[PDB]
Amino acid sequence: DTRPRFLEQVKHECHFFNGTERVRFLDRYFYHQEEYVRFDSDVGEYRAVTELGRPDAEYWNSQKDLLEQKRAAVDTYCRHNYGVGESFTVQRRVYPEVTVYPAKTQPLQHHNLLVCSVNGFYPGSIEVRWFRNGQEEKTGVVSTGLIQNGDWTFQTLVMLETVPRSGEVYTCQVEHPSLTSPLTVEWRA
Amino acid sequence: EHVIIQAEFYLNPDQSGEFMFDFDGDEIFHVDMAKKETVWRLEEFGRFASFEAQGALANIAVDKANLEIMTKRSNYTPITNVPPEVTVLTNSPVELREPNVLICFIDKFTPPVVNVTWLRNGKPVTTGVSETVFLPREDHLFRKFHYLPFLPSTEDVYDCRVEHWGLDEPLLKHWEF
């Protein structure tokens, strides 16, 4: 199918700072990827973002009843919808399951990668550190970054490049908003 | 602190539309336009909230009419295809005979049209598979997840096969134990 495609997008956005104390509402219209017109509750009128949106900015700003609906949206839309879902979104907390296992940078060589696998958590903000014998290892740390699983859980792998020696105890430490104290998992060679 | 987005689109000539709510990058729900039903991303959500699907249907109709207007304003300038990046991963560390889930992450693409096939040892598989609708990005491209529950064995290889008009060939992203 080589037929040309044409795409319209609308995003009605509610931005929340400190709960519902501070709220910003954005009404955004797009043609393919191009935002052409936008209502910003910081302004209280529509503004053309590109020339393609000038007709709508003029037409919509002439509808004073429309502008007043949009000027009230921080309350009737943003604050309302935030309240509706607060218990299972804002207050959603899911514990990180932590797994430590060795791996290899090159097959047929020896174990030179310690993987701290942190799985299934919510929300996304997380801090993962590596320790050897109670000392933080800041070198040779590489990660997948934060991965969104698409199902309201996250994961991340945080890997330590090291050659394990006998007697060495390695500690993966995970801090997350669902936890009251750091979570640690040891691995011994 | 948090962002909630009601994201909509309508696409010609496919005549496909979509309506969804996003919280911090995760889908709260979307509206099945065919069934005219609200579909919660997690079943628990539906026990705590509701949404009248008719309002989504009304907005999509406006979006369809607006697309016709904007297409003319642009002098029928069509969309440029942006092919997706594809990643295959498991949602938990893999252990033989321990049930797990393969995730196929299709990212940074437009238009929101894709054919995704799971392959087990080169053959299509469908029992147990599931998928999300098209999810919005801050750069106004799209992303999408497909899932395949599986039992890890040393005998099976897997591929996620993604077809998109921005790709020359189908893209196949491989996974094996």
């Binding site: 037409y59 839309y77 | 009601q6 909509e8 709260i28 907005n59 207007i69 904007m70």
Partner: peptide
């Protein structure tokens, strides 16, 4: 509670 859709607006012709 019920989610409340922000309405789309018809473009200028």
């Amino acid at each position: 509670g019920g989610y409340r859709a922000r309405p789309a607006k018809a473009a200028a012709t």
